[PDB]
Amino acid sequence: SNVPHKSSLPEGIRPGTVLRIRGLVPPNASRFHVNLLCGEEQGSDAALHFNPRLDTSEVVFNSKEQGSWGREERGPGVPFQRGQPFEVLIIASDDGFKAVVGDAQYHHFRHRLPLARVRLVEVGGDVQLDSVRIF
């Protein structure tokens, strides 16, 4: 069973915040996601949707605003593998979110929504989480 992991952020997140996600991509994984969302409602606007796609060998970044998706950005290749553990940082600055995978800077996603609207982090899909922490 895939069960979403939710972290409420009722005072939001400010520049200089680190979301640290550790887990395993299980053997039959298709894709999983890390979403920074504006509210608890299903289909909430998203400042960031980070979506490793093992099935298509891509990592997609997008936002959702006023109920519509933005233009996808892609990182280089896919630094995740079925059957292997990973660590991702998502780091908030004034300018955007930096994604770090393993020991490497991976992608910068410029803010599209104001960072102050973020209220929730949801991690789900085909992933077995070790831990999620927000600093």
Author numbering: 1 to 135
The article reads:
Galectins are members of the carbohydrate-binding lectin family with specificity for β-galactosides. The CRD is about 130 amino acids long, and the β-galactoside binding site is conserved among galectins, while differences both in adjacent β-strands and loop regions explain the variation in oligosaccharide binding affinity.
The overall ‘jelly-roll’ fold is conserved compared with the previously obtained native and carbohydrate-bound complex structures. At the N-termini in particular molecule B presented some residual amino acids from the histidine-tag cleavage forming a tail lodging itself between two crystal-related symmetry molecules. Compared with the available structure, residues 1–3 were well ordered in both chains as well as Pro10 and Glu11. Six residues showed potential alternate side chain conformation, namely Val18, Leu89, Asp95, Arg110, Arg117 and Arg133. Molecule A had an unusual difference electron density around the buried thiol group (Cys38), which is not conserved among galectins. Cysteine was replaced with an S-oxy cysteine in the structure, with potential oxidation due to radiation damage.
